[PDB]
């Protein structure tokens, strides 16, 4: 059987990096399909196929322009086709999946997708429709706060450079009602949420480099033991920097606490600051628990393959890599059961 | 050991009736796959497996709605998969083939297909792709005139009774560009073309029952000796009705004539009118030549098996039955030719 993983994110920045981090622990390099469309959003690897949910846009870019709607609006997406095709792939059936051409903003003729071992649906509405949601074996939500969203556009984007600060944040809040109505409530269905906030260690930092990252983990989910620090289920803050581990400004600060998140029980691990050298990453990993690693240091090693990645110096890469490991552990138990069941 | 026949025909009129007249000739009764999907379009016989090319649609009904594209458009069909699976079947390889559901409009899980003695692929685009065209051992194109499609929609199809004439003719017009561009040109690749036109015997008739049917037979094709009437190559008109064969109104009228069709030499046989007594059918069959019958009255006998079929009293039934007998003859010769070749190769080893 194929196992299906939802990834809810805005397409701009972290989702690409998050997806690359998830692909690297699941298997080999994910590449576009061999022939066919050069503007295909599909990424294919030996174990995983990544489907961009833009392909299920029911509304052409110019159709949306003529319409009241935007890409966030459910009017603009075809959840019937999305449900049916995701459902078919999970049962080992190949699907003819249309292609949303981002360059031309057009719907291209479809591509035949073969059923993978690991299917990741990634985009704006993976958890929006309940039929789709019931198919997922694991759900991810990458939640960027608006403060950091703004910083990245200014500090880390070249397309936005033609626009003023006024115009860029005008657009952000102009899209905020649709986002709050249609994207943000998907958090409640996620098994793992990575919330990205400005750091508290530096007062008035808006640069997007030092960040407060929260890893919210649902409890009671079968095959998914949440990560914890020192004493599972208690409330802990933890500064690793000391006599034996020296840090630069501002350093590292960890928080671990239970919580109630959309009327579900969760465990929250939090890292504020950035790693200014590699010993701190090694030290942090050695003190976390329930990381779903195969050997001591795997989180570090898996991060070291993508040192150039954005967020590799802070909690973004650390928690995205941990979430990828937990997912692997989970599908192994799903698949273990499945393969033994077949026997 | 698989012969592949191409049947290009428009969706909704006489394509279903045609395919059933061929399976009667090719072998026993053709039934759906045992159990399985109730809406599967595959018909299975002892000798024949017929594949509906709708199965290789890439856009489903609703996808076609939102992509603003018809089922006649190449963009809505996956010709790569169609090609791959036709060559596999021709190579004795079974395929798992998706099913296009006509009631739901969706693509459903696939059905495994075993390689048959005779594989007929019928639908919109059997000759549209040269790779798939290259696998055909024979090809047919059913060319219903625009006047007769409308007649059949009004006179025959009960489903069209919900629509008024404007919607019916608008829908025809809505698909006309794609038909002219992508379907109609496949005629030129067809070894046999059946062209269904309004009658001339009844002036102004438009009721789709009295028909002028042209059987267009491509010349110079190996194992295919076209039907002819009295004197091969001449231009003949024949009214068999008379004092020794009595007919009703309007009667029978045949035309036999050579022609050039897309710059290939063709021999075309025409029936205008309709049969009202069985003697008329037996008399016509008895006077034609190169029918590839195995005995006197095979055509008549084959048509009486399916007497309540539409077009059973005009040239549509007559010439479809005969195309079946020509094809049967052709694959008998090709199988024997292929079998002689294999034995020679086996003596060589």
Portion of residues in helices of chain A?
Answer: 25-40%
Count interface residues per chain for the largest interface. A-B, 17 and 18 residues
Distance between the termini of chain A: 14 Å
> If helices are DSSP runs of H or I spanning 4 or more residues, what is the number of helices of chain A?
9
Strand content of chain A: 15-25%
Family (chain A): Belongs to the phosphoribulokinase family.
EC number (chain A): 2.7.1.19
Keywords (chain A): ATP-binding, Calvin cycle, Chloroplast, Disulfide bond, Kinase, Nucleotide-binding, Photosynthesis, Plastid, Transferase, Transit peptide
InterPro entries (chain A): P-loop_NTPase (IPR027417), PRK (IPR006082), PRK/URK (IPR006083)
Based on the model shown, name its key terms:
dimeric; ten-stranded mixed β-sheet; two-stranded antiparallel ribbon; homodimer; Phosphoribulokinase; Rossmann fold; alpha/beta; 343 residues; transferase; phosphoribulokinase reduced; 14 strands
Report on this model:
It is classed as transferase. Two copies of one chain form a homodimer. In chain A, helix 5 crosses helix 6 and helix 8 packs across helix 9. Chain A folds into two domains: 142 residues, Rossmann fold, CATH 3.40.50; 153 residues, no CATH class. Chain A contains nine helices and 14 strands. The first copy, chain A, starts with a strand and ends with a helix. Helices cover 32% and strands 24% of the residues of chain A. Chain A is globular. Chain A is α/β, with parallel strands linked by helices and 343 residues long. At the A-B interface, helix 3, strand 4 and strand 5 of A face helix 2 and strand 5 of B.
């Amino acid at each position: 059987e194929t196992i299906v993983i939802g990834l809810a994110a805005d397409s701009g920045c972290g989702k690409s990096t998050f997806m690359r981090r998830l692909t690297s622990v699941f298997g080999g390099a994910a590449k576009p399909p061999k022939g066919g469309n050069p503007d295909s959003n599909t990424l294919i690897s030996d174990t995983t196929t990544v489907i961009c949910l833009d392909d299920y846009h029911s509304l052409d870019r110019y159709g949306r322009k003529e319409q009241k709607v935007t890409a966030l609006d459910p009017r603009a997406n075809d959840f019937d086709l999305m449900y049916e095709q995701v459902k078919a792939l999970k049962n080992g059936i190949a699907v003819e999946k249309p292609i949303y051409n981002h360059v031309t903003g057009l719907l291209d003729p479809p591509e035949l997708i073969q059923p993978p071992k690991i299917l990741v649906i990634e985009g704006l509405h993976p958890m929006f429709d309940e039929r789709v949601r019931d198919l997922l074996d694991f759900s991810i939500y990458l939640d960027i706060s608006n403060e950091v969203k703004f910083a990245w556009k200014i500090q880390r984007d070249m397309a936005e450079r033609g626009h003023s600060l006024e115009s860029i944040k005008a657009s952000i809040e102009a899209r905020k009602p649709d986002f709050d109505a249609f994207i943000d409530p998907q958090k409640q269905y996620a098994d793992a949420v990575i919330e990205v906030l400005p750091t508290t260690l530096i007062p008035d930092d808006n640069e997007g480099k030092v960040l407060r990252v929260r890893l919210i983990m649902k409890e009671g989910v079968k095959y998914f033991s949440p990560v914890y620090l020192f004493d599972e289920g208690s409330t802990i803050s933890w500064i690793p920097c000391g006599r034996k581990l020296t840090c630069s400004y501002p350093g590292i600060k960890f928080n671990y606490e239970p919580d109630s998140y959309f009327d579900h029980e969760v465990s929250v691990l939090e890292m504020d600051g950035q790693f200014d050298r590699l010993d701190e990453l090694i030290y942090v990993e050695s003190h976390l628990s329930n990381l779903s690693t195969k050997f001591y240091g795997e989180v570090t090693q898996q991060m070291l393959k993508h040192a150039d990645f954005p967020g590799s110096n802070n909690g973004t890469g650390l928690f995205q890599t941990i979430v990828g490991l937990k997912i692997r552990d989970l599908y192994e138990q799903l698949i273990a059961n499945k393969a033994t069941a077949r026997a």
